[model samples]
Target: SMQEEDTFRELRIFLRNVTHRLAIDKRFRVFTKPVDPDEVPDYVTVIKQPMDLSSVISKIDLHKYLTVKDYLRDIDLICSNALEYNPDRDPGDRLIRHRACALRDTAYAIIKEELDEDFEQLCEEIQESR
Candidate 1:
């Protein structure tokens, strides 16, 4: 329970920090839609939109956005490793497969953090939007 709680907190912090950076960076503007002008609140409203991976890749130069590129690479590698699906091979293989799946899903879970959606739901949205 303690480890689970700690992981939850870590996720919360990660979401908060990423959302804050998305708010701050002009390059991440595509992820947020502009609030309607008629709203009485003077504050700018950032509507969370589905992130377009290709758009992200095309628009952001890897050299210019080195931090983002590094994170993307990290996520990609995790997901790639997780794709070596051989869950039924044996007990040890099953355990390895399970952990790989968890890591892959957790990496993807980052995108769904702010949206309150699970990985499949987010992936569905991504597909439909694209």
Candidate 2:
């Protein structure tokens, strides 16, 4: 058991730093809060489920994201939602999609920095067992 919760050490601190680091980037700013359905006109109609960084932050505080995989699930939704929501193409709304791509890849790069192939192999194994 000596080494078990060290996973928490890595998972928690890595997630904390990732979330905070992504928060500081300007491209991530607009996606940091939940989109207002009323203002958006069609947001709720188009997006069946909404994910945003503010909710991500709350989850982090409440011990909801226990693994990197869990962390990335919400992260993926945030980016994916942005890309698909305004699919028809308004140029200004289109710009947010670029930021979405950047946010996802930036997170992917950061997640890459933390885990090696060996760890990812184990990461999946641990996920299934739970």
Q: What local distance difference test score does each model get?
A: 0.42, 0.79
* Tens-digit lDDT string for candidate 1 (1-130): 5644454444445444554554344543322333335852442232223232333333343322223323455445433433342336778656656554554454456555644445334434433453
Residue 61 of model 2 has an lDDT of 74
Candidate 2 wrong stretches, greater than 4 Å: 1-3, 116-126
lDDT, candidate 2, 7-87, per-residue tens: 555666667788888989997899888887677878878888799877888887777765678889989999889888866
- Best TM-score among the predictions, by candidate number: 2
Candidate number of the best lDDT: 2
Error of 2 at 104 (Å): 0.6
lDDT of 2: 0.79
Off by over 4 Å in 1: 1-70, 82-88, 115-130
